[PDB]
Amino acid sequence: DTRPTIRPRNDVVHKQLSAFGQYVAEILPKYVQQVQVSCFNELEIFIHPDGVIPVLTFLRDHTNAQFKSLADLTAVDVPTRQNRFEIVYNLLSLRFNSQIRVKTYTDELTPIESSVTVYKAANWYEREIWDMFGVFFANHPDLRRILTGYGFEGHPFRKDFPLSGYVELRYDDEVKRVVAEPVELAQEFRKFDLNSPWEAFPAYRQPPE
């Protein structure tokens, strides 16, 4: 690189992924709403909520995809979107050493039928997406709590949920049992507003709205 400071880019993978992005797009014009290949050679397949089985089964068993490695499933709670939750699958191909990202919008009540049949790895990887966020997964073997406390109330990763939560424990000599009380902190979280009032990088700027 002539400029060693900035990270070199790989264009060869860029259109090759872009070619594969159109590829999967033409097979399913019913499901694939949006395909996007980012600057860092990462491809994203935006699908409809009821596409968890079809496209994943497509990516898992296709001759030209063979994406059978379920990397992770994550939600991105975005309050300003009418669909707050954004379930994100990550897929990995052993044969083509590439990565696949598919995202589905979902509301709180609207369920997502479980992808356990496609990948059995998602069995445990839904018990926390129901825990942290509260998105319910339909026709799933078990939705048990494995991160939150036994009988804990709420979905902590939701951004309407406080960092300190609501309940704090303490052993009580009156009852010989640790019990919960409303949280009161020794010191409150001194929040910092670090968003500079002067505009950042103009590339990703939103259009005049």
């Binding site: 060693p4 990270r7 880019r9 991160l147 939150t148 406390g149 990763f157 960092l163 670090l194």
Partner: protein, 60 residues
């Protein structure tokens, strides 16, 4: 017959507080994530963050 590995007995905010700590402040979290592989976690974080910044570290 069956075994249920009830996890959670060490569950922490981690990702929850990362939403409130800056990138530099969030770096020590990964050291405590896979606490036996100290430097390898930060490798993942630094590789990720510098990828978004489109900045590559010097060869040294």
């Amino acid at each position: 017959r069956k075994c249920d590995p009830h996890i959670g007995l060490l569950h922490r905010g981690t990702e929850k507080l990362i939403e409130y700590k800056t990138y530099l402040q969030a770096l020590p979290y990964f050291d405590r994530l896979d606490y036996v592989s100290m430097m390898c976690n930060e490798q993942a974080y630094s590789l990720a963050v510098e990828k978004l910044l489109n900045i590559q570290p010097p060869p040294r």
